[PDB]
Ligand binder design. Structure first.
Ligand SMILES: *[C@@H]1O[C@H](CO)[C@@H](O[C@@H]2O[C@H](CO)[C@@H](O)[C@H](O)[C@H]2NC(C)=O)[C@H](O)[C@H]1NC(C)=O
Lengths: 48, 49, 49, 49
């Protein structure tokens, strides 16, 4: 179980899903289109 | 100023080259949902209008 | 495959595959039924010979 | 078609069309196989006549 963690600006959380494309999915981190796994995201303005 | 939604402003972009990558790379576009075509390939197509 | 990217194209391709493969299964079934009819005619022709 | 509008109904219709069309292809295939059996019996009857 690889756990991969990073930060992204709120409305870009849509980009992460498998088969998406755009700034994160194109140039930073892409999920495989047959990904088995879970994407966990939560607000961090209280910290970051 | 844009149009109001009831009277949408329509412009024919035609007889011109269009790189859609420079659109899609704009961090402004919170929504860029496409149908029947995928953004990664738009530059491989040409369209009648 | 020019318009769409793989994750969407796979759904479109699967529908053409389904219909093209069902067209072929219909063809090969029909040719098997009709080949049995020709072999009946060939056995009859051999007997008449 | 009383419950749903077109964009949703078309998926529901496609499922019924698939299953109803496969029902007919099963019928017509089996009726062809069984028609060959009748034609064998008819040729035997003609020969016995
Ligand atoms: C609308 O105006 C903006 C600001 O003048 C243009 O912004 C450029 O957009 C491209 C594509 O994302 C970037 O590569 C440039 O770096 C941007 N320039 C600046 C100064 O921010 C934008 O090009 C214009 N819209 C269109 C469709 O051309």
């Amino acid at each position: 179980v690889y756990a991969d963690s990073f930060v992204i600006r709120g409305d870009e959380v849509r980009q992460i899903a498998p088969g998406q494309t755009g700034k994160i999915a194109d140039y930073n981190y892409k999920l495989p289109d047959d990904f088995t796994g879970c994407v966990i995201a939560w607000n961090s303005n209280n910290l970051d | 100023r844009f149009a109001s939604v009831y009277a949408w402003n329509r412009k024919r972009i035609s007889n011109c080259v269009a790189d859609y990558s420079v659109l899609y790379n704009s961090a402004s576009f919170s929504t860029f949902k496409c149908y029947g075509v995928s953004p990664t390939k738009l530059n491989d197509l040409c369209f009648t209008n | 495959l020019s318009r769409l990217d793989k994750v969407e194209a796979e759904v479109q391709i699967d529908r053409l595959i389904t219909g093209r493969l069902q067209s072929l299964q219909t063809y090969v079934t029909q040719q098997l039924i009709r080949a049995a009819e020709i072999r009946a005619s060939a056995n009859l022709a051999a007997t008449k010979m």
